[PDB]
């Protein structure tokens, strides 16, 4: 799996967004556009995340 680390808190705005906290590790499910990816959190919740707010995590 591909993972990213949150650089900032993301409260989200829209129903489809996946909120997260600074430092969280998120799994990338797919990449429907350049700056918004579909991710999954450790609780199994899914949604859109802003790519500028994350870093590759390996």
């Amino acid at each position: 799996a591909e993972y990213v680390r949150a650089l900032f808190d993301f409260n989200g705005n829209d129903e489809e967004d996946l909120p997260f906290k600074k430092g969280d590790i998120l799994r990338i499910r797919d990449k429907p556009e350049e700056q918004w990816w579909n991710a999954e959190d450790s609780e199994g919740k899914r949604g859109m995340i802003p790519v500028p707010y994350v870093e590759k995590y390996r």
Binding site: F8, E34, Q35, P52
Partner: peptide, 13 residues
């Protein structure tokens, strides 16, 4: 680096 603004959503099918 700071906190970049939230990116626009392109919302393409």
């Amino acid at each position: 680096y700071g906190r970049p603004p939230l990116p626009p959503k392109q919302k393409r099918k």
